[PDB]
Amino acid sequence: AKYTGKCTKSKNECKYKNSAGKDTFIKCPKFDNKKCTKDNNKCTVDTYNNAVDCD
Template sequence: MQITKIALFLFAAMGAVASPIEAEAESGINARAENGANVLYTGQCFKKDNICKYKVNGKQNIAKCPSAANKRCEKDKNKCTFDSYDRKVTCDFRK
């Protein structure tokens, strides 16, 4: 009986220590918000190659759109965005 009480106490203590703290600052400012204007790049996607072409500082870049049926480029010159922070491409579906 004594071992179960100690085990229960240790389990509760580990849960309290391992619980996450609030990650967002009270002021609402986080590291990503500082460069938010420079993070998203808008371009055009092309159906044949399933790619997104966007420009960064005048230089054209190419990123592959996701291959899932509901996320790939459906029509030439649809809008697409590249998030340089997360390195994710979003090809707008049927727009």
């Protein structure tokens, strides 16, 4: 667990609020460990498993 994020399948990208305050958004490919789902689906920010924030 880290932060709560949300990604839109429309743009296949996720974005969340960080300490900096600057909204950060990043798109993910169609490969494994890079899938995109509903915003509230299961989008989260993690770096332990090298997994990207997209869901």
